[PDB]
Design a protein around this ligand. Structure first.
Ligand SMILES: [Mg+2]
Length: 270
């Protein structure tokens, strides 16, 4: 019968992340000055800022109680901080996750989910927690992320181009047109967590040379129209955090849209 967490709103949001009691913390580096500024800037670009945040939420529940009102305030506020930052990243592309999280207007503690929530997610490291947001509070509404933002790394050796073990190469030219399943969770802990396994389509050329070396020059887009956000679809360590949290609190399954197209070129040797 699970617990409800109040959506982020000025009316209920705590004044700061962790209400002061805990914080996002970079790795330790000796020194002072602008050096330390770089350290926190790069830490907000790491997937570890997302894992730390989730872990610190999980840790606080264990220590204080899932139904403790303050815990419930903390889940809501903290997620909202992520929701606000991810909003800044969508509305100001190519800016730093740090500056997105810390942009003073609008105030991050004044984030209002009901009026501010967006279909579009950035695909940056903030997105997994925002994906949790939309489960908690989205009411099965549809979301979206561009495939150009999910940090795709293709390894043609895992596709249908692997049927080059036929040694036929060269050339040089081999037309490729295939659908394939791609496990983002295998290498990308951000994307794996909320998208997990996706189905992709690729058209392009495979260039194998006389000495076993090969290049695949092609285009990738989503094969399936949509993907389900539920516990069975989460992949990787962060996905596991999402699953444990989502079981504990009330929410609704939704679909995520994956539009757009990328260009890849990937080489190797037999
Ligand atoms: Mg790190």
């Amino acid at each position: 019968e699970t617990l409800t967490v109040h959506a982020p709103s000025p009316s209920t949001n705590l004044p700061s992340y962790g209400n002061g009691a805990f914080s996002l913390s970079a790795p330790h580096v000796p020194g002072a000055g602008p050096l330390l500024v770089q350290v926190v800037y790069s830490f907000f670009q790491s997937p570890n800022m997302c894992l730390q945040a989730l872990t610190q939420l999980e840790d606080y529940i264990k220590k204080h109680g899932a139904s403790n009102p303050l815990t419930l305030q903390i889940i809501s506020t903290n997620i909202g901080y992520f929701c606000n930052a991810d909003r800044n990243l969508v509305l100001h592309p190519g800016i730093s996750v740090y500056d997105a999280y810390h942009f003073a207007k609008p105030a991050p503690s004044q984030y209002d989910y009901r009026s501010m929530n967006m279909k579009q997610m950035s695909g940056n490291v903030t997105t997994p927690i925002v994906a949790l947001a939309h489960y908690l509070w989205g009411n099965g509404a549809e979301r979206s992320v561009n495939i150009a933002n999910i940090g795709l790394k293709i390894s043609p050796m895992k596709i249908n181009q692997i049927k080059d073990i036929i040694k036929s190469g060269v050339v040089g030219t081999f037309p490729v047109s295939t659908k394939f399943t791609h496990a983002t969770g295998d290498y990308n802990v951000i994307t794996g967590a909320y998208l997990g396994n996706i189905t992709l389509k690729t058209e392009g050329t495979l260039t194998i040379s006389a000495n076993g070396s090969w290049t695949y020059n092609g285009v990738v887009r989503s094969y399936d129209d949509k993907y389900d956000f539920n516990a069975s679809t989460h992949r990787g360590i962060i996905g596991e955090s999402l699953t444990r949290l989502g079981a504990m609190f009330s929410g609704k399954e939704y679909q995520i849209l994956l539009p757009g197209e990328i260009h890849i070129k990937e080489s190797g040797k037999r």
